[model samples]
Target chain A: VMNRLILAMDLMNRDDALRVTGEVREYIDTVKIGYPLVLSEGMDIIAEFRKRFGCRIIADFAVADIPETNEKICRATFKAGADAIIVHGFPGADSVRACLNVAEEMGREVFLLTEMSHPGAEMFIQGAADEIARMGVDLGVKNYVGPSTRPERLSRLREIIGQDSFLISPGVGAQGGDPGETLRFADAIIVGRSIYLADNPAAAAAGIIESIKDL
Target chain B: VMNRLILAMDLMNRDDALRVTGEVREYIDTVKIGYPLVLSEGMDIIAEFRKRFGCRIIADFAVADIPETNEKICRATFKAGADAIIVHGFPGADSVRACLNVAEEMGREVFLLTEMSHPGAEMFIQGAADEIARMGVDLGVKNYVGPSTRPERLSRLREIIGQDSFLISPGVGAQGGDPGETLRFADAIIVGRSIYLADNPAAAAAGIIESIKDL
Candidate 1:
């Protein structure tokens, strides 16, 4: 089985980004470019990182927009050489379908923000997952971004949705979430500030990777 | 009689964004660098645009994190020459208060995303605007972006929030909304694709400005 760990390079500048990316090369093959850095650096950042990391780039844009608008965003992310992109499942099925179609056309992977770890997030994500799954089915989205804190629940979801679906778990570090539980359900885990902002980011990330590997 | 429009260049590249910004420059005094563009281009775009156009810039990043994170984003926006920034109004009075405190400390104006234009937005904006207003105290918000479509209902909101609150009307143009009706109730209009994608973008933007001026 492939061991995939996402290195979340949140809001780093060109110099800091390059340094961090170079540091984590040994531990993580997939690097996450989130809203903060994406807002700060633009598509050029993604392009530059892609030039360095090749196909290992994952865009955590969490792009939420109307159906037409979502398609445009997905296309932009794909053109930026994003191996994977994130979209919200809360925008109803039409928006998800639209983004999925664009992702399919672009030959990029999709990650649906199905279930977040935050307590408030449950009101929507858990309540609406079934409806979203039904809607997302036609689009053939195989990957979803769910809270790592709820591995057992996600396991139930995997059973309901099918084993072929991949779950990308965020909120692992700094949020007091259990990595062991998350790894049981998640196909991949994203670690950001816990590693990126640490005293020894490289070592810290390596530790997480080792722990997950053990799981 | 200041005819200043606010164009939100959402899901656009820097070149197209600049082109659209230029087209509306004659009419618009403020450009909202929303989350998408901020996440995409970062402060470079904000700084570059500020240098190119003397118009006021409102960074619609909608900072909602804890005090420290909120302060960082607020200060960053100001450093990038943003005249104002937006913070979500949904995070309760304490969060809004924290953002206001940070904005004051940084000498940047704070705009609240109160009463968003969605159908259910009324439940929160209407429910909490008074409480938020109290938290805001004498500090009038830079603007309030809300969906006040029906002319008949506009007065009610204006009366509830008071005249001093600048209503930034979105959902116009492609959303089957009219500027004439909006102008009667709003201090400014926030438009996106209506101008950017038009055949005569500048002309399209000018028409809205002209129509608003006539009011």
Candidate 2:
């Protein structure tokens, strides 16, 4: 099993992401490269992370596009050394399938975003979570993204997706998500601002690790 | 009014994007830097486009995040010389507002994705399109994205978003969108694969321009 914590390197600056990832490497199993960092530094940042920390990296692309384009995007991210990439379920099955095909071919992984952690996520992803989860399972995706901030929704998603697949939750700390409750259902927790923005990122991540260690 | 043709530079490689942008610069009003090109080349690609074509650049970020993160993403894109940025309205009001705040402060533009060009777009964007359009209008956003393949939805969005705001439509050519009927409702069209994948991209873009000239 992977570590219970994943550091979301959502910073706009590449150096900040590098610094934070370096600091929190001991506590987390993987690091998430969000759009901001990916756009700012390109795939080179992934290579930089691999060189520095040698930890798993998830490209949090939230990819939403046609099948062909999704394949191309996934190829690009995987070639850049992403262990896994996030695809938005909002684009429906074909797009997700395309991403899965690429992941299968490239020996990478896909994490389907059934729901998000933000308040407005319910407005778009609320009704479609179960359907998306089913589609993801059929398509052979083993990881899913849901809201750590909403434990009820997370629990529901856990049932739909089942225990075999990993449920990665974001929205802990600054996003007002509680890891203690979230870890109950989530196989791994994605914490961003709580640790990354802290004055002592290492200590912050250590605290989170300590809390989730028993789970 | 903006140009009727916005080249969706959705290529996976920076060199392909540069070559096509150079070729189609004369025919299109703006160049949209989608996730692939932006991620492959970083913000330097935006600067490269500005240096080479001196045309409007829309960072098709489709940005979705909380207020602070959204602000940082928008600021970064604008600083890289993007004339406009595409933001996902699915993140809700605060997130959208954060992006708008940055656009307002920077004197850049915000294009909200009320809908997308893919087949599965409606599955997620359908229910929330009108509400998003209304929120976009309320936020004072002047640009919106809708599918050119679905002119009916485009027309509905046009009505909800009001005639003053520009509707940029994708899903043309390879995506099965026809510009003839779509142009009647869409203020501008975003064409990608049709032109980018053609034997002669310049000629392909020219043909698209000639067809939409009367609109």
Candidate 3:
């Protein structure tokens, strides 16, 4: 099970990202590091987060490429010390399977991002999200990322993937999703701007944890 | 207009990638650097390609994330010296628009990847590719990336995006897409494994260039 909250460390600078993550390190055991930090500070930042904080790192690249290219992306990311990767299922089964293949070979996990938490997601991603989740289930995917901002969609994803599969949700805090309410369905809630951009990151993270402790 | 052929440097190692790309410098003025090379070697490799070959670096990231994350990815890529970045339209307009906003701010270009050139792409991408292309045009996008393997789909994408938009196709050579035939609809064809894995990379590039010269 996820530690209830995974810090979405999307800050584009190494110093700020590291400082903010370190400030709230004790509250979370997993940190979702994406392209913003990796592309800015280099992929080694994954290793740095593992070494310095000893937290599980999820390379949230949301990879959406050809199967061949997706394989390479997953490999390089795992090589840099990511425990899990987030991939998009909208590219269809082959692209998603490519990541699954690499993750299997490398002994890492792949988290399927079924639907996003943004308003525009309703346009296309929302329409295909159910089928995409069903495709992930058919492909034997065990973990997924759903939208926290829309609890109904998150609950629907939970229903599709079932209770056994681990599901994490984003759009908490700054995106206006309540952490405790999001935990009604998701195993963990991904919080970024609310914690990292706060006047006191540790205090902010503590507040979120305090609010959701009973959930 | 793009160069007749853009080198798809998906090779995972820097040595082989740099050597193969250098061997075909004269034949190419734009190189598509994806996560394979950047994640393997680092984003700085984008600058290396620009400095050594003076070629335009397309950070073919196939970006698919939330709007905030997409903005950071584009900014980081542009800051590291990419002339343009390839983004996926499947995530819907908001995500793609986030990339476009950063690209426009950084004076860089965004090439919307409307369709992929692989068999798995037919599952969902092909069904939505036309609408994605139309959405790109609606957002004032002027550049695009389509699949080379499916000529009908490529031509359909061309028709949707229209004649003025610059379009590039991938899946040439190793993926069984023809360089000359792809050119009939695409502005430039992306060639990878066939050239990079050849006994003589320069000769292979030359052969493709030779074959497509009349087109």
Interface RMSDs of all predictions? 5.9, 2.0, 0.9
User: Candidate 1, residues A1-215: lDDT per residue as tens digits?
Assistant: 13567877875477787887788777777788865566555667888887786637778756544466667667767877788888766555666777778877988888887655645344334665565555556567788777766776667656655778877777787765666778787788877778878888888878887787787
Per-model DockQ: 0.19, 0.56, 0.83
lDDT, candidate 3, A148-170, per-residue tens = 89999999999999999999999
Off by over 4 Å in 1: A119-139, A150-160, B10-20, B35-42, B60-76, B86-105, B110-143, B148-164, B213-215
lDDT of 2 by residue, A22-119 (tens): 88887776888877776666778887787789888899888877777788789888888889999888778888999989999999899999887877
TM-score of each candidate structure, all chains considered together: 0.78, 0.95, 0.98
In angstroms, the error of model 2 at A90 is: 1.2
TM-score of chain B of each: 0.85, 0.95, 0.98
Q: In candidate 2 chain A, what residue range of length 10 has the lowest lDDT sum? A: A34-43
Per residue, candidate 1 scores C-alpha lDDT tens digits across B180-214 of 78777877777887888788888988888778778
lDDT of the structure predicted as candidate 3: 0.91
Better of 1 and 2 by lDDT: 2
> Measured with DockQ on alpha carbons, how good is candidate 3?
0.83
How many Å off is the CA of A82 in candidate 3? 0.7
Best by lDDT: 3
Which digits, one per residue and each the tens of the lDDT, describe model 2 over residues B8-114? 88887777788888888778768888777866667788888877888888988777666777887888788889999988887788888888888889998898998
Note the residue pairs that clash in candidate 2: none
Q: Considering every candidate listed, which one attains the maximal TM-score?
A: 3
Rank candidates by lDDT, best first.
3, 2, 1
